C-alpha cells in the first residue's frame, strides 16, 4: 500500500514530527520514504526542461520498484579510467578495444587506438543508457524495468545518482509507506484529500499537484484521513503550528424559531487557540451586555487571514456595529475541514529591527491594546504597552496638531466656510465620496501631508530608533516611506468594516463625519499594495510562546532563561542593558553559549535619574552601528521577544562602544 | 437621519458585483487553449442513495394517564426506522448517508418546516431587499430552477459496492444485509431495513412493519463472476429516493454510453501511429472496468466552434500554439542544419580579384545563416494546419525597399530570396506577390498594363493581399508582350505552370477519436505541396520533386535575364561569367530539404496532428484560381430580431474570424538551401524510436472529456433560460403556477451567470466554461460557422445538438415539483385572511371547504387596478370602489392581487386591519405560490393568531413579502377537553402532503388530524403483487425500491496499454 | 477601485480604469508581447550571453 | 443631472471591455483595429453630460 501527503517526507525526520497524525489521522507498518532528495532534484530539473514533460513523466513512477542510477564520465575520462589502474573493463568491449587498453604506454602517435576510440560509442557496451537529448518520460520508463540506469548527465528525476569512477575523472519496506508524489502506475496507490491545492507551503508540490489534478483527476483513487484512520487500525521545533478552519453559520432566533442567515468559513485559526478556549460544535452568544464582541470572537477574527461565505465566494467583512442591516449576534460552528501545518516566521522578517505595522484608520486599535497588554505565557511580558506606539503620536508634538492642521483646511475651497458644510458638501445621503470634490479636497491635503509631517515623522522614527526597539502603527504605506523609516514593513488588514467603526466611538475630538473623511483622505494616500491580514502578525506574536511552554515548563526558570543585551566594561567613573530575552531548553542555551556575540557594536549614552519604584535605572540610548542581528543566529528552536526599552541597573555616562554578552546560568 | 445614514452605508457597501471579469482575459485564453483541465466525471458513493429524511417535530407524550409506560418500544431501547413522535414531517437533504469520495460543492438542505426556510429563496437576485426576512415574489421561478439545478448537480455519482454479511437473527430469512463504512455504523440498519424490525406492538410502524412481505430485504440479485474477485453489480432492496435513483441510472447510462475497452485502445493508438509504434491490450476475461472516453461527433465540432471563436482577430492566443509545434516537429524530426554547406559550395567560384562586385560573396552577406534558422521554418511548416484562422505572410522587412532596379545585384539576390520562398507560406496572394517581387523591379525596363493608377507597376507587392487586387495581366499572360517585356513572359508562365500543387494525406483515428474537422470531410488533411510516400527506408538524394523544379526554374530565368541583351553591354565578361557559374551552380546545390518536405514530412505531421491540444482547422487550399480563394471564415453565437432558423439568420449574424502572421523570408530559404540527414539514416527505426515517448500520455483523451462537458452545459444553458424567457427553442415548461417577473437581457444575463457558476462548482472546474457564449445575450443563441469564397458563393455547418442528460434531469425534477411542491417547502394557491373563532380540530393546511371562496362564487367583490377609498363623513362608513365601477363599504370577502396590496402596503393597513380583526371581511389574496412556517399549539389551551398575523401584514414590502406563518393544532392519542383557538390565515388548496405521520408509537390518535403511514409510498412492501422495480415517479417518490451498485473500477490507460518498447 | 485582487504579490489594472496610467500600461505591455515572441530571446546561448 | 438620477439606465463601461480587448495586437508593426477603437471610445466612468 502506498498513500501520499501534501507535504516533505523524510524517515527520519518526520517520524520525529510523526507527520501524520499532523492532517488528523489517528495511528510499526507506516514505513516513511526519504523525498527530501527528490525535492532539490526537482527545482534542478526544472531549470533546463519545461514543467509538463518534468511532472507527466515523474507521474508515471512507482514507489517500491527499487532502482538507482549510475554517472559515468563522458567518453575521454572513461577510456582513460579503463587505461588506469583497475582493469575492471566489462564484456561488452570490443576484444580489440580491450587488447589495445591491456598494454602500456599509449599515446597519440598510436593509429591503431584512436581508429577505433574514434568510432567507439558508450551505448555500445551500455545499454538502456540516458543521454542528455532523451525526453524525462523514458528515463522514468526506462528505470521501472532494470534496478539500474546508466546515464551521462547529472540532470535526472526520480531516484538518487551514484557514480561511476572516482571524481578525478569527473568535471527496506514495510505494509504501509507514505509519500509525497502520488504514483499510477499500481492501480492501486493513493492520494489524501485533507488540504486542498491552495495552502501547500512548498510551491513545487503545490505545482505538482496542480498539474496532476487537473489531468488525472478520474483516476486517482482519492481517499479522505478519515479512510486512512480506518485503514492503519484495523529537536521539537516552534514556528510549525497547525492550522485548521472553522464552518460556521450565522443563526437569528428572534422568539421561538431559529432562522439561518449566512453560511461563512474562517481559513486559517492556529489550532491551540481553539483548544485551549475549548470550543465545540455548539452555539454561541458573541456580543456582550454592551454590543462588544466577547474577547474571544475578537481574538478568534484577529488571528484568521480571512472570512468568506460559501453560496458565493467573495469577501464578507462582518458588521462590527448593532445597527440592524445586518448584525452577527449568534454562531453555530459545524466543523473543521482541512489541516495543515504552516510556517508561522515570514520571509520579510529577517534581521532584528523594529515593526511598521500600517493598520488602517478605523480599525480596532483601542481593543488590541488592551489584549495584547494583558498576556504572559511565562515569566516575561509578550507585548506591553510601553512597548507600543500609537499612529496618533508622531503629529501630536506640533503647532496645532495635524489633525487640527487639516482641521482648517475649508479656508481656501470656494462656497465652503464652517467645516460640517464642507462635510455636508463632499459626502451624500450614501456617505461615499463624490469622485471630484475628494480630489480637490486632496490636492490641499496633500503638501500639509509631505513637506509639513514627514519630516517630523523621520525625526521622531530616528529617536525611536534610538531609544530602544519598538512597534509603531501607521495609518498609510507612505507616510512610513516619505519618512526614512528604519525597520520591517508590514501592511495590515483586519476582517471587519472599518467604516461604521468612525460612527460608534464618540469623544473624537472634531466633526464625528470629519474624521471619516481624513480616513478616506489616508485610504487614497497610500500606494496600491496589497495588505496582509493582520493574523499573519498576531499568529508570530502568540502562537510560538503558547507552544513553548507545552515544552519548557516546569524545567527551571534560572536554566531556561537567558537574555542578550549591550555590555560595558566596569572600568568606568561615576553595566548590561538588555536587548532580547530568550527563554529555551537547556540543550538550546547551551548550543547558544558559542556563536561570539562580538561583531557588533553600538554606541551608549547612558544618563537619567531613577524613574520607578523598580531598582536601579538609567533609561540609555544605543545606537547599532554594524551590521543587525540575524535571526538564524538565535536558533528555530528559541522563542524571544521583539520588542525592549534599554535600561541598566549615580553619576553620569557618555559614549561608550560597547559590545554584547550571553550570560545564562 | 443619523443612525439611518449608516443602514444606508451598509446597504450599498454589501450590492458589490459577484463578476469582476472587467479585465483582460487573452494571457488566460492562451493558457486555456494550451491546457485545458478535465472534469471530474466518475464519483463514487458508498451509502444509501437518498434525498428525503424523515424528522420528528413535536416528540411523543412517555409518560402519560391513560397508557402505561410498559407499551411503548422507546421504553426498551428498541430501534425504530421512523422517529417515535408525535408529529413527524418529511424534509429534504441531499447526501446524508454518503460517505462520498469528496463532495460537488452542492446541497440542498432544509431546515423544519417550523423554522424559517427563506433563505433559500433570496439567494439569486435580491441584491435590493432589505430585511433578514422577506424575498421578491417575482423571483420565485428563477430561485426554485435554480435551487433545481443544485438538486440535480448534487446527486451525479455512482452507488458502490460495499460488502455484506448474513445476519444471525432470526429477524428474516438468513437474508444478506449490506454494511456501509463510516465512524459510527451500528445504527443505519434500524433506518436501512424498515422490515427487519420485530412486531410487539399495535403501535402504528408495528401496524405498518407487520402488514408488508418478508422476503425483501437486502440482497436478491449478484453477478459472480471470477473466483475470489469482487462481484460487478448486485440488486438490494434497501431504503432509497426513487428520484435519486433515476438521476444515477441516467448518469450511469451517459457513462455506459461513453465505455471502451483497451482492445480499440490498442488499434487507435496504432493506427495514429501509423505503424510506426505498436502497442497491446490482453486477452483473457476482463475485470470489467470503466473508461469512459468515446464521444460523438457533433461534441467535438461544438467545441472546435467554440475554441475558433475564442481566438478572435488576435493572433497572440494562436502564436504560442505554432511556436508549440515548432519545438514537436523539431524533437522528431530526423533533418538538421548543416549551415556550412553554402560557405563551401562557393569557394570555388570562378572571379576575378580585379572586380569591384563579387556574386559569390554578395550571396554569402545577403544569406548568412546563424543556426537559429529552423525556428522560422517550422512555424511556417506548422501553419499549414490552420489557414482558416492562420494567414502566413513574409515579412514586410524582406522586401526590397522601394523597388530594387535589375541592374542592382544585391536587389537580383533579393528577388531570388522571395522567389524561393514564397510557395511555402499559405497565404492565397502569394503567387501575385511573387510576380509583382519581378514587376517591381523592372520598371523602366520593361513595362506591362495595369488596372488603375493606384495599383500600378511601381505599386509595391506587399501591399498585394486582397485577392481581386491581382492584375488583369497577371491571369491573361497574352496581355504581357512577349516582345516588349519578354522576361516577365517568362516568369508569369514559371508561375502558371511550375507553381506546387496542393495534396492529402489522411491522419487520424474515427473509432476512438471524434474527427474535430469541419468544411473537410473527417481523416483527411491538406497540404499546400504535393507528396509521394517513399519506397526506400535508407534515403537518398534526388532531385525530381516540385521544389527542385522551382528552385532549378528560377535560376534559369536569372541565366536568361544575364544574358539578355540590354542587361549584358552595362556589365564586363569576367563578371558575367562569374555571376552565370554561381547561378548553374546554386540551381545544382544538394540539399536534403525539398526530398524531406516531399517525403518525409507529411507522414510525421499525420503522426502528430490526432495527439494535439487544439486539432486542425482547415479550408481548401488552391494555386492560381481568383474564384476559390476563402474570405470571411465567420462564427456565430447568437440570432436576430425575429428569424429562429440558424441557416436564414447565419449570412448577417456572424463575426469574421483569423489573423495574418509575418515570417521572414531569409530564414526560410536558409532552410530550403541547407538542410542534410543523419549519416546512416534508417527511417524504420528512427521513427520508431522517435514516436515511443510521445504516445504513452493521455491529455487527449482529458480533452475528450472535457468536450462532453462543454457541449453539456450549452443545452443546460438554454434550458434553463428558456423557463424564465422566450426563446425559439421548443422546451417543456412546467413552472407556470409560480410567478416571477418580464425579465430582461440583463436578467437573463445574470441568472446564466448563476448557472455556470454553479456549473462549474460542480465537476471541480477553475477556468472559462460558456463565458464566449455569455459575453452577448443568452436568451437566443445558436452556434453555426461559414465562409464564403471570392465569387459569393458559401459553404455552412450547423451542427446539431446532441442528448444531455443534466438538462433531461432538471425537467424531471421539475415534473416531480409539479406534484410534490410541498417537501420543498412551497405552497400552491393563495390564502385567505379573515376571522375564524371554532374549538374545531381542523388543519389549515386542509381547510374545510365551507370557508373559501373564488371569483365564481356569487357576492365576491373583485379589486383590480382601481382602488381609490372614499373616507366617511359624519358617521357614514368609508367605502372602496369595485372594479365594475360599485363602491362597497369595509364587509364581505373580497378578491385582491398581491401587487395591489404591495403598492400601498402603508394605506391600506390603517384603514383595513381594525376591520379584519373585529368586524367582518375576509380577504382572499391571489399570489399562486409561497413559503410557510409552521407554529403548533397546545390545543388545551387559548391562542390568538394575531400577533402573528399582524406581524405577516405589517412586514409585506413593494420588493419583498415575508414567509406566511400558520397555526396547526397538535394531536394527541387520548381524549382531551377543547380550548377556544383564533385563527386567520388559511389556505385554500390542499396543503398537506409533507406530513409523513402522527402519532408514531401509539395505537390510535383521536383528536387533531391523523395519517397513518403512507401505504402508497412503500409500495413494494405494502403490494405483494407489484414487480420489484415498479416506479411510478411523476405523482410520488415512494422512498424505497431496488437500486443497482456497481464495483467496477477506473485503472489508467497506461496500466492496460503497455507499448513493447 | 481601479485595481484587483493580487496575482500573488501584483494587482493588475482593469482596463475600465478613468486614469491615465492605461496608456502606461499598454505600451510595457506591448512591448512585453512582442519581445516575448521574438525568436532570439530562447536559445540558450543567448542567455548565457544576458547572464554574461 | 435630472434626468441622469430619475432614469432606470446606468452606462456600465464594461460591456466594450468585455468584448474589444485592448491586447490584440493583430498586426507587429503599429496598433490593430481593435485597439485602435477603444483609444478613441475611451471607456472611462468620467461623465456623459
Known amino acids: 500500500a502506498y498513500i501520499a501527503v501534501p507535504a516533505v517526507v523524510d524517515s527520519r525526520s518526520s517520524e520525529a514530527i510523526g507527520l501524520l497524525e499532523s492532517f488528523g489521522v489517528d495511528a510499526n507498518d507506516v514505513s516513511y520514504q526519504d523525498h527530501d532528495y527528490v525535492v532539490d532534484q526537482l527545482q534542478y530539473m526544472l531549470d533546463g526542461y519545461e514543467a509538463g514533460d518534468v511532472i507527466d513523466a515523474l507521474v508515471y513512477r512507482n514507489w517500491l520498484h527499487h532502482s538507482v542510477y549510475c554517472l559515468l564520465p563522458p567518453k575521454s575520462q572513461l577510456l582513460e579510467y579503463w587505461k588506469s589502474n583497475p582493469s575492471v573493463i566489462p564484456d561488452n568491449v570490443d576484444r580489440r578495444l580491450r587488447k589495445r587498453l591491456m598494454l602500456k604506454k599509449d599515446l597519440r602517435k598510436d593509429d591503431e587506438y584512436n581508429q577505433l576510440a574514434r568510432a567507439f560509442k558508450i551505448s555500445d557496451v551500455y545499454a538502456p543508457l540516458i543521454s542528455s537529448t532523451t525526453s524525462p518520460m523514458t528515463m522514468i520508463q526506462n528505470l521501472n524495468q532494470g534496478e539500474i540506469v546508466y546515464t551521462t548527465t547529472d540532470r535526472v528525476i526520480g531516484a538518487r545518482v551514484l557514480l561511476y569512477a572516482p571524481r578525478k575523472y569527473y568535471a527496506p519496506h514495510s505494509r504501509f509507506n507514505v509519500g509525497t508524489f502520488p504514483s499510477i502506475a499500481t492501480p492501486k496507490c493513493s492520494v489524501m484529500s485533507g488540504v486542498d491545492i491552495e495552502s501547500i507551503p512548498n510551491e513545487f508540490i503545490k505545482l505538482f499537484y496542480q498539474r496532476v489534478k487537473s489531468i488525472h483527476a478520474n483516476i486517482l483513487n482519492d481517499i479522505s484521513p478519515q479512510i486512512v484512520s480506518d485503514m492503519i487500525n484495523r529537536h521539537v521545533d516552534v514556528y510549525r503550528v497547525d492550522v485548521v478552519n472553522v464552518l460556521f453559520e450565522v443563526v437569528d432566533v428572534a422568539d421561538g424559531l431559529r432562522s439561518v442567515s449566512r453560511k461563512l468559513i474562517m481559513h486559517t485559526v492556529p489550532v491551540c487557540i481553539l483548544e485551549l478556549l475549548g470550543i465545540e460544535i455548539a452555539d454561541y452568544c458573541i456580543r456582550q451586555e454592551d454590543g462588544m464582541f466577547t474577547d474571544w470572537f475578537l481574538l478568534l477574527t484577529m488571528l484568521s487571514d480571512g472570512l468568506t461565505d460559501r453560496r458565493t465566494h467573495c469577501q464578507y467583512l462582518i458588521n462590527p456595529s448593532s445597527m440592524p442591516p445586518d448584525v452577527i449576534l449568534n454562531i453555530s460552528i459545524t466543523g473543521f475541514i482541512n489541516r495543515h501545518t504552516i510556517d508561522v516566521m515570514p520571509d520579510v522578517y529577517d534581521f532584528i529591527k523594529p515593526i511598521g505595522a500600517v493598520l488602517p484608520k478605523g480599525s480596532f486599535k483601542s481593543t488590541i491594546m488592551r489584549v495584547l497588554d494583558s498576556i504572559s505565557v511565562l515569566g516575561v511580558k509578550i507585548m506591553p504597552r510601553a512597548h507600543v506606539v500609537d499612529s496618533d503620536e508622531v503629529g501630536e508634538q506640533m503647532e496645532p496638531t495635524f489633525e487640527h492642521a487639516v482641521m482648517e483646511i475649508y479656508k481656501g475651497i470656494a462656497g465652503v466656510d464652517s467645516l460640517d458644510d464642507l462635510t455636508k458638501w463632499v459626502l451624500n445621503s450614501d456617505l461615499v465620496p463624490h469622485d471630484d470634490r475628494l480630489g480637490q479636497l486632496f490636492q490641499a491635503f496633500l503638501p500639509l501631508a509631505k513637506d509639513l509631517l514627514a519630516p517630523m515623522a523621520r525625526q521622531f522614527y530616528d529617536n525611536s530608533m534610538s531609544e530602544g526597539r519598538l512597534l509603531t502603527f501607521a495609518h498609510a504605506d507612505s507616510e512610513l516611506l516619505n519618512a526614512n523609516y528604519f525597520g520591517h514593513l508590514l501592511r495590515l488588514k483586519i476582517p471587519y468594516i472599518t467604516e461604521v467603526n468612525l460612527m460608534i466611538r464618540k469623544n473624537r475630538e472634531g466633526g464625528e463625519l470629519f474624521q471619516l473623511v481624513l480616513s478616506y483622505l489616508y485610504k487614497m494616500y497610500a500606494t496600491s499594495a496589497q495588505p496582509k491580514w493582520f493574523g499573519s502578525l498576531l499568529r508570530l506574536l502568540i502562537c510560538p510562546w503558547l507552544h513553548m511552554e507545552k515544552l519548557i515548563g516546569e524545567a527551571d526558570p534560572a536554566s531556561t532563561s537567558a537574555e542578550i543585551g549591550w555590555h560595558v566594561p566596569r572600568e568606568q567613573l561615576m553595566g548590561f542593558i538588555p536587548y532580547v530575552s530568550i527563554r529555551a531548553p537547556r540543550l538550546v542555551i547551551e548550543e547558544l553559549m558559542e556563536k561570539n556575540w562580538g561583531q557588533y557594536h553600538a554606541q551608549v549614552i547612558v544618563t537619567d535619574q531613577l524613574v520607578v519604584g523598580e531598582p536601579r535605572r538609567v533609561s540609555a540610548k544605543a545606537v547599532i552601528k554594524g551590521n543587525h542581528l540575524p535571526v538564524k543566529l538565535i536558533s528555530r528552536f528559541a522563542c524571544f521577544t521583539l520588542t525592549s526599552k534599554y535600561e541598566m541597573r549615580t553619576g553620569r555616562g557618555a559614549a561608550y562602544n560597547a559590545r554584547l554578552a550571553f550570560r545564562s546560568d | ?1061 | 477601485k481601479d485595481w484587483t485582487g493580487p496575482i500573488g504579490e501584483i494587482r493588475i489594472l482593469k482596463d475600465t480604469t478613468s486614469s491615465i496610467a492605461r496608456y502606461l500600461y499598454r505600451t510595457w505591455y506591448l512591448a512585453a508581447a512582442r519581445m516575448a515572441a521574438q525568436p532570439r530571446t530562447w536559445d540558450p546561448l543567448f542567455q548565457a550571453i544576458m547572464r554574461s
Open chain 2, 1 to 1061: 437621519e443619523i443612525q439611518r445614514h449608516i443602514t444606508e452605508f451598509i446597504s450599498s457597501w454589501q450590492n458589490h458585483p459577484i463578476v469582476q471579469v472587467s479585465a483582460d482575459v487573452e494571457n488566460r485564453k492562451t493558457a486555456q487553449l494550451l491546457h485545458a483541465d478535465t472534469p471530474r466525471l466518475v464519483t463514487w458513493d458508498a451509502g444509501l442513495c437518498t434525498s428525503f429524511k424523515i424528522v420528528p417535530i413535536v416528540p411523543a407524550q412517555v409518560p402519560q394517564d391513560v397508557l402505561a409506560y410498559t407499551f411503548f418500544t422507546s421504553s426498551y431501547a428498541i430501534q425504530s426506522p421512523f422517529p417515535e413522535a408525535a408529529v413527524s414531517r418529511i424534509v429534504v437533504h441531499t447526501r446524508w448517508a454518503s460517505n462520498v469520495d469528496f463532495d460537488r460543492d452542492s446541497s440542498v438542505i432544509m431546515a423544519p418546516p417550523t423554522e424559517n426556510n427563506i433563505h433559500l429563496f433570496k439567494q439569486l437576485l435580491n441584491t435590493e431587499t432589505l430585511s433578514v426576512r422577506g424575498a421578491n415574489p417575482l423571483m420565485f421561478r428563477a430561485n426554485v430552477l435554480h435551487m433545481l439545478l443544485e438538486f440535480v448537480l448534487d446527486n451525479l455519482y455512482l452507488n458502490r459496492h460495499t460488502g455484506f454479511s448474513q445476519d444471525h437473527t432470526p429477524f428474516t430469512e438468513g437474508a444478506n444485509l449490506r454494511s456501509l463504512p463510516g465512524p459510527d455504523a451500528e445504527k443505519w440498519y434500524s433506518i436501512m431495513y424498515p422490515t427487519r424490525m420485530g412486531t410487539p406492538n399495535v403501535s402504528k410502524i408495528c401496524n405498518f412493519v407487520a402488514s408488508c412481505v418478508r422476503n425483501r430485504v437486502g440482497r436478491f440479485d449478484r453477478a459472480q463472476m471470477m473466483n475470489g474477485a469482487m462481484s460487478e453489480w448486485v440488486d438490494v432492496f434497501e431504503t432509497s429516493d426513487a428520484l435519486t435513483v433515476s438521476i444515477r441510472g441516467r448518469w450511469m447510462a451517459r457513462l455506459a454510453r461513453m465505455n471502451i475497452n483497451p482492445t480499440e485502445i490498442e488499434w487507435a493508438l496504432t493506427e495514429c501511429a501509423q505503424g510506426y509504434v505498436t502497442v497491446t491490450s490482453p486477452y483473457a476475461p476482463s475485470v470489467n472496468r470503466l473508461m469512459p472516453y468515446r464521444i460523438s461527433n457533433a461534441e467535438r465540432q461544438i467545441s472546435q466552434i467554440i475554441r475558433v471563436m475564442n481566438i478572435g482577430n488576435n493572433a497572440t492566443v494562436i502564436q504560442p500554439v505554432l511556436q508549440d509545434i515548432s519545438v514537436l516537429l523539431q524533437r522528431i524530426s530526423p533533418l538538421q542544419i548543416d549551415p556550412t554547406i553554402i560557405s563551401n559550395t562557393m569557394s570555388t567560384v570562378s572571379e576575378s580579384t580585379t572586380q569591384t562586385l563579387s556574386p559569390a560573396s554578395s550571396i554569402l552577406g545577403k544569406l548568412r545563416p546563424s543556426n537559429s534558422d529552423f525556428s522560422s521554418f517550422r512555424v511556417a511548416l506548422a501553419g499549414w494546419l490552420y489557414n482558416g484562422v492562420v494567414t502566413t505572410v513574409i515579412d514586410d522587412s524582406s522586401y526590397p525597399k522601394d523597388g530594387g532596379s535589375v541592374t542592382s545585384l544585391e536587389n537580383l539576390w533579393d528577388f531570388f530570396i522571395l522567389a524561393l520562398a514564397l510557395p511555402l507560406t499559405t497565404d492565397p496572394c502569394a503567387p501575385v506577390k511573387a510576380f509583382m517581387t519581378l514587376a517591381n523591379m523592372m520598371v523602366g525596363f520593361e513595362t506591362i498594363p495595369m488596372d488603375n493608377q493606384i495599383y500600378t507597376q511601381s505599386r509595391r507587392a506587399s501591399a498585394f493581399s486582397t485577392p481581386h487586387t491581382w492584375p488583369r495581366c497577371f491571369m491573361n499572360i497574352q496581355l504581357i508582350s512577349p516582345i516588349d517585356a519578354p522576361i516577365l513572359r517568362q516568369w508569369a508562365e514559371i508561375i502558371h505552370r511550375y507553381w506546387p500543387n496542393p495534396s492529402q494525406i489522411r491522419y487520424g483515428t474515427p473509432n476512438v477519436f471524434g474527427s474535430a474537422n469541419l468544411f473537410t470531410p473527417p481523416e483527411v488533411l491538406l497540404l499546400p505541396i504535393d507528396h509521394q510516400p517513399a519506397n526506400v527506408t535508407t534515403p537518398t538524394l534526388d532531385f525530381t520533386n516540385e521544389l527542385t523544379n522551382w528552385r532549378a526554374r528560377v535560376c534559369e530565368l536569372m541565366k536568361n535575364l544575364v544574358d539578355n541583351q540590354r542587361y549584358q553591354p552595362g556589365w564586363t565578361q569576367s563578371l558575367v561569367s562569374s555571376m552565370r557559374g554561381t547561378l548553374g551552380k546554386l540551381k545544382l546545390i544538394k540539399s536534403m530539404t525539398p526530398m524531406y518536405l516531399q517525403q518525409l514530412a507529411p507522414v510525421e505531421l499525420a503522426v502528430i496532428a490526432p495527439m494535439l491540444p487544439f486539432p486542425p482547422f482547415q479550408v481548401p487550399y488552391v494555386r492560381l484560381d481568383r474564384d476559390r480563394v476563402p474570405t470571411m471564415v465567420g462564427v456565430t453565437r447568437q440570432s436576430r430580431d425575429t428569424i429562429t432558423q440558424p441557416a436564414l439568420s447565419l449570412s448577417t449574424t456572424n463575426t469574421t474570424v483569423g489573423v495574418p502572421l509575418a515570417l521572414d523570408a531569409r530564414a526560410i530559404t536558409v532552410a530550403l538551401l541547407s538542410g542534410k540527414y543523419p549519416p546512416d539514416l534508417v527511417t524504420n527505426v528512427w521513427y520508431a524510436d522517435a514516436i515511443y515517448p510521445m504516445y504513452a500520455d493521455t491529455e487527449v483523451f482529458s480533452n475528450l472529456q472535457r468536450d462532453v462537458i462543454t457541449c453539456e452545459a450549452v443545452q443546460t444553458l438554454v434550458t434553463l433560460v428558456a423557463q424564465i424567457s422566450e426563446t425559439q427553442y421548443p422546451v417543456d415548461r412546467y413552472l407556470d403556477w409560480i410567478p416571477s417577473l418580464r425579465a430582461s437581457a440583463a436578467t437573463a444575463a445574470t441568472f446564466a451567470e448563476w448557472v455556470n457558476t454553479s456549473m462549474k462548482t460542480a465537476f471541480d472546474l477553475s477556468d472559462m466554461l460558456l463565458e464566449p457564449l455569455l459575453s452577448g445575450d443568452p436568451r437566443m443563441t445558436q452556434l453555426a460557422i461559414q465562409y464564403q469564397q471570392y465569387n459569393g458563393r458559401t459553404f455552412n455547418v450547423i451542427p446539431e445538438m446532441p442528448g444531455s442528460v443534466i438538462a433531461d434531469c432538471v425537467q424531471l425534477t421539475a415534473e416531480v415539483f409539479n406534484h410534490e411542491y410541498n417537501l420543498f417547502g412551497i405552497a400552491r394557491g393563495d390564502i385567505i385572511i379573515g376571522r375564524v373563532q371554532s374549538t374545531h380540530l381542523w388543519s389549515p393546511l386542509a381547510p374545510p371547504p365551507d370557508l373559501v371562496f373564488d371569483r365564481d362564487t356569487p357576492g365576491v367583490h373583485i379589486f383590480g387596478r382601481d382602488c381609490r377609498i372614499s373616507f366617511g363623513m359624519n358617521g357614514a362608513a368609508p367605502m372602496i370602489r369595485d372594479e365594475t365601477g360599485m363602491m362597497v363599504p369595509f364587509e364581505g370577502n373580497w378578491i385582491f392581487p398581491l401587487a395591489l396590496w404591495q403598492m400601498n402596503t402603508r394605506y391600506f393597513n390603517q384603514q383595513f386591519d381594525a376591520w379584519i380583526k373585529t368586524g367582518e371581511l375576509r380577504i382572499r389574496i391571489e399570489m399562486g405560490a409561497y413559503p410557510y412556517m409552521l407554529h403548533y399549539y397546545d390545543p388545551r389551551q387559548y391562542a390568538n393568531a394575531w400577533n402573528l398575523t399582524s406581524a405577516w401584514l405589517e412586514e409585506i414590502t413593494p420588493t419583498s413579502i415575508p414567509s406566511v406563518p400558520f397555526m396547526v393544532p397538535i394531536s394527541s392519542d387520548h381524549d382531551i377537553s377543547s380550548a377556544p383557538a383564533v385563527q386567520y390565515i388559511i389556505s385554500t388548496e390542499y396543503n398537506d402532503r409533507s406530513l409523513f405521520c402522527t402519532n408514531s408509537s401509539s395505537p390510535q390518535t383521536i383528536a387533531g388530524p391523523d395519517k397513518h403511514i403512507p401505504v402508497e409510498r412503500y409500495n413494494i412492501l405494502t403490494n405483494p403483487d407489484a414487480p420489484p422495480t415498479q416506479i411510478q415517479l411523476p405523482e410520488v417518490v415512494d422512498l424505497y425500491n431496488v437500486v443497482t451498485r456497481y464495483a467496477y473500477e477506473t485503472p489508467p490507460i497506461t496500466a492496460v496499454v503497455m507499448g513493447v518498447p
